[PDB]
Amino acid sequence: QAALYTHHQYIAGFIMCGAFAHGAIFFIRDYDPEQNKGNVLARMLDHKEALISHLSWVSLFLGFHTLGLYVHN
């Protein structure tokens, strides 16, 4: 049980990182703004600053609170 769960979870983590890496490779090599004009894909790059900022806020809040509660305990 321990070995199987750990094996599958680590493999899943590596595969997820690979998915995002290939997404970045798609943006650099295969993205065409002229063909994707106004669709959801172009709108992702349109408000990317908002997405990164909100992800930063969520990560900061979770890190500060989890670390604070652990140090307090």
Binding site: I28, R29, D30, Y31, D32, P33, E34
Partner: protein, 144 residues
């Protein structure tokens, strides 16, 4: 203006020698030779380590790469106000003049030069990589 001819029987600055000198590349691939005219004897710093004494008049030195020769050229121009020049020498004896290319230093504009590798547009006007994909080899969008 005329291309200078390398004089192998040119005196060299008095240096005791070092371990940062030439290697097997000077005998197998190529090396560089820097020559200059000094008005008086003066202690200068060697690009490969150590302090040498440049003689009065012609002075010749050998280096492993072009960067060492241009570094010594910049040092001689900015510290003693001289006019040095260097060549690339091959093991078969071929000498190729390198800097200054036209006898005039490249910082100032000189007539007769032709601009190369110049794009008549800006960076933001480059094409997307999808347009340069599936080429003969890896081609950047700025190469065209």
């Amino acid at each position: 203006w005329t291309v200078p001819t390398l004089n192998p029987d040119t005196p060299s600055p008095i240096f005791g020698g070092s371990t940062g000198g030439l290697l097997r590349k000077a005998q197998t691939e190529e090396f560089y030779v820097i020559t200059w005219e000094a008005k008086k004897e003066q202690i200068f710093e060697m690009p490969t380590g150590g302090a040498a004494i440049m003689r009065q008049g012609p002075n010749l030195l050998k280096f492993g790469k072009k960067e060492q020769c241009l570094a010594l050229t910049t040092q001689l121009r900015n510290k003693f106000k001289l006019t040095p020049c260097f060549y690339r020498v091959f093991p078969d004896g071929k000498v190729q003049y390198l800097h200054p290319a036209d006898g005039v230093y490249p910082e100032k504009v000189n007539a007769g030069r032709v601009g190369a590798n110049q794009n008549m547009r800006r960076i933001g006007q480059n094409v997307n990589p999808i347009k340069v994909k599936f080429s003969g080899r890896m081609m950047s969008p700025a190469e065209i």
